[PDB]
UniProtKB/Swiss-Prot annotation, chains A, B:
GO molecular function: ATP binding; fructokinase activity
Protein's name in the database: Putative sugar kinase PH1459
Keywords: ATP-binding, Kinase, Nucleotide-binding, Transferase
One protein family per Pfam: PfkB
Annotated binding of ATP, by residue: 189, 214, 219
Class in the EC hierarchy, top level: transferase
Family: Belongs to the carbohydrate kinase PfkB family.
Enzyme Commission number: 2.7.1.-
SUPFAM superfamilies, sorted: Ribokinase-like
Organism whose genome encodes this protein: Pyrococcus horikoshii (strain ATCC 700860 / DSM 12428 / JCM 9974 / NBRC 100139 / OT-3)
A biological process from GO: fructose metabolic process
InterPro entries the UniProt entry points to: Carboh/pur_kinase_PfkB_CS (IPR002173), PfkB_Carbo_kinase (IPR050306), PfkB_dom (IPR011611), Ribo/fructo_kinase (IPR002139), Ribokinase-like (IPR029056)
Length: 304, 304
C-alpha cells in the first residue's frame, strides 16, 4: 500500500515578524513543499510514503533528507543535484496579505527523466503531484512524462495549488499544462477560487474518480459522478492552520487507499477530522499521528 | 571625484545561533556583498560613491536599493533582472570554522555589457572590483571587459577576496582570471594567506601602483615600488570585525583619492584608524562616518 508524491521539496524561510518581506528581519527555517508536506502526512497516518524530488548537494538538501527520514518518508527517490542548490522560498504568512518569494533556479525544478527512480513510482497505488513543480522545465516535462507513463497502474492525484506569480509570461502554457494534468488525474483537489478561475477559461476542474473542493471557512465538498457531499468544518480554536490543506490531502489519499469503495461520507468525516486536528500543531507538517486519531470512531473506520 | 564599485550586491542571511548551516534554525537578513560594503564605506567617508550591480525585480532587490540610498550611495547603476532573483547567501560567522551557502544562480552573476552604465564607470576616478563576481559568467566576462576598457582612464582597485568554494571544478580557470585581474590593477588588496596562496601558484600579488597586504588583527602592510611600510593595528576591543576589510578598502581608496601624493604614512594611519573604529559597529557596513572622524588628526589630514 504505497503512496508516492512527486514535486517540490524545499526550505521555507518563514518570517518571524509582521510586515512585507522587504522589511522582515528574522526568518525561521523549516522543511516545505506541498508534495513533501503530503508525503509526511501520509506517513503520519501510518501508510508507507515515498517522495520523488531533487535537492542540491548542500547543507539544506542534507537537512531536508534528514527531516524527511525522521518522519519515516522513503527518501531513495530524492536525487542530489551537483549544479543547482536546494530550493528555497521566503514566506510571510501573517497579515491580511500573505506573500512569498520563491527562488526558481533550484534543484527541484531541474529534474530530468534520468533522475526518476521508476521502481518507487511503479510500486505506488497512488501518485500525487501538484502544479508548482510544473512551473518550470525540465521538471515540467519530466513530471508530465512520468504521469503519462504510469497512468493505469496507479491512481493519479493532483492538487491544483495555483500560484499565478509562478506563471507570469506563460499564462497560455499554464492553462494547457493544468488542463492536461487534470485530465490525467483520477483525484483532483482544489479551492473554489481555483475552480472558478480555471472554469472561467474553458477548463473543467474535475477528477475522473473524485473531486475535492475546499471552501475555506465553510469546509469542503466531495464530488463524484454527480454525487455531491458537503462537509462543514469543525469549530475549534486553531493555533496554526498553515499545514491544514496538506493534512487534508494526506487524509483524502489515505482514505481512498484504505476504504473499499469511495464512500464519500466516511471519507469526508475522516478528512475533516485530520484537517481540524492539524490546526492544533504548528508548521507545514501538522498532520496528526495515527495514534492520536484511533481515539476517534471517524478514524477507526478508515485506519483501524 | 567619484569612486565606483562593481560587483556582487546581495542579501546576507546571518545565522542567529552557532552550528552547521544544516542545523541553524534562525537567520537575520542584512545587505551584503564586498563591492557594496565598500561603496557604502566610501559614501560615509564623504566621497561620491556609485555601485554597479544587478538585483532581481523582487522585494529583496528593493530592500537593497532602499538601504543603499539611505547611505547616499548612487544606485542608478543597479539594474533589475527580470529573469533572476536577488542574490542571497546563508552565513555562519560563528565557530572555529565559519561557513556559507551562496546561491549562485542569481541576478548579480547575470550582468551583461548592456547592463553597465558606462557614463558612471568612465566618470569615476577609481573603479573597484573583487574576485567573487568573477565566479560565474556572464558577469565574469562582462566585468573583465569593463575593466580593460577603462584601464588607463581610471585607477583600478582589486580586492582578491578569495573564496575557493566558488571555484570548485574550475580551479585552473580561477588562477587565470585572478592573474589577469591583478595585472589590470593599479591597487591590489589581499590578506597574507591569499598572497601565500597565489604566489605559490606562480601568481604575483602586487598592484602596479600600490599593494595592501592585511595581517588580520595584527595590522597591515602597504607596499609601493619596493617601499615596504608596516602599520601595526591600533588597540581596540572589537565588537564585530565582519566589515573591517571593506572599511579598510573604502578608507584605502578614499585616501588614495584625496592625498596629493602617495604618502604611505598618511595613508596607513588613516586606513588604520577607519578599520580599527569599524570594529566598534556591528554588521557588514561598519565604516565610521566622516563626522565621527573629524575628531581625529590622522583623519582631518585626508578629509579636511
Ligand atoms: N581586532 C582588531 N583590532 C584592530 N584592528 C583590526 C582588528 N581586526 C581587524 N582589524 C583591521 O581591519 C583590517 C581588515 O582585516 P580583515 O578583517 O582580515 O580583512 P581582509 O584582509 O579582507 N580578510 P577577509 O576578507 O575576511 O578574508 C585589518 O588589517 C586591521 O587593520
Amino acid at each position: 500500500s504505497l503512496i508516492a508524491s512527486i514535486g517540490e521539496l524545499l526550505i521555507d524561510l518563514i518570517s518571524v515578524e509582521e510586515g512585507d518581506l522587504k522589511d522582515v528581519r528574522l526568518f525561521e527555517k523549516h522543511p516545505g513543499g506541498a508534495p513533501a508536506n503530503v508525503a509526511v502526512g501520509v506517513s503520519r497516518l501510518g501508510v508507507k510514503s515515498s517522495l520523488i524530488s531533487k535537492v542540491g548537494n548542500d547543507p539544506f538538501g542534507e537537512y531536508l533528507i534528514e527531516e524527511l527520514s525522521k518522519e519515516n518518508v522513503d527518501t531513495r527517490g530524492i536525487v542530489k543535484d551537483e549544479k543547482k542548490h536546494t530550493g528555497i522560498v521566503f514566506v510571510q504568512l501573517k497579515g491580511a496579505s500573505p506573500s512569498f518569494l520563491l527562488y526558481d533556479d533550484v534543484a527541484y525544478f531541474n529534474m530530468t527523466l534520468n533522475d526518476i527512480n521508476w521502481d518507487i513510482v511503479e510500486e505506488a497505488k497512488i501518485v500525487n503531484f501538484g502544479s508548482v513543480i510544473l512551473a518550470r522545465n525540465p521538471s515540467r516535462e519530466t513530471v508530465m512524462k512520468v504521469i503519462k507513463k504510469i497512468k493505469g497502474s496507479s491512481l493519479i492525484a493532483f492538487d491544483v495549488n495555483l500560484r499565478l506569480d509562478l506563471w507570469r509570461g506563460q499564462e497560455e502554457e499554464m492553462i494547457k499544462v493544468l488542463e492536461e494534468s487534470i485530465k490525467l488525474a483520477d483525484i483532483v483537489k482544489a479551492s473554489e477560487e481555483e475552480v472558478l478561475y480555471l472554469e472561467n477559461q474553458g477548463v473543467e476542474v474535475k477528477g475522473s474518480m473524485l473531486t475535492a473542493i475546499t471552501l475555506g471557512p465553510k469546509g469542503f465538498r466531495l464530488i463524484k459522478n454527480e454525487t455531491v457531499v458537503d462537509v462543514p468544518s469543525y469549530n475549534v480554536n486553531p493555533l496554526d492552520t498553515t499545514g491544514a490543506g496538506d493534512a487534508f490531502m494526506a487524509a483524502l489519499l489515505v482514505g481512498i487507499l484504505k476504504l473499499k469503495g469511495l464512500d464519500l461520507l466516511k471519507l469526508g468525516k475522516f478528512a475533516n477530522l485530520v484537517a481540524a486536528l492539524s490546526t492544533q500543531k504548528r508548521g507545514a507538517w501538522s498532520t496528526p499521528r495515527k495514534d492520536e486519531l484511533l481515539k476517534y470512531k471517524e478514524a477507526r473506520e478508515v485506519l483501524a
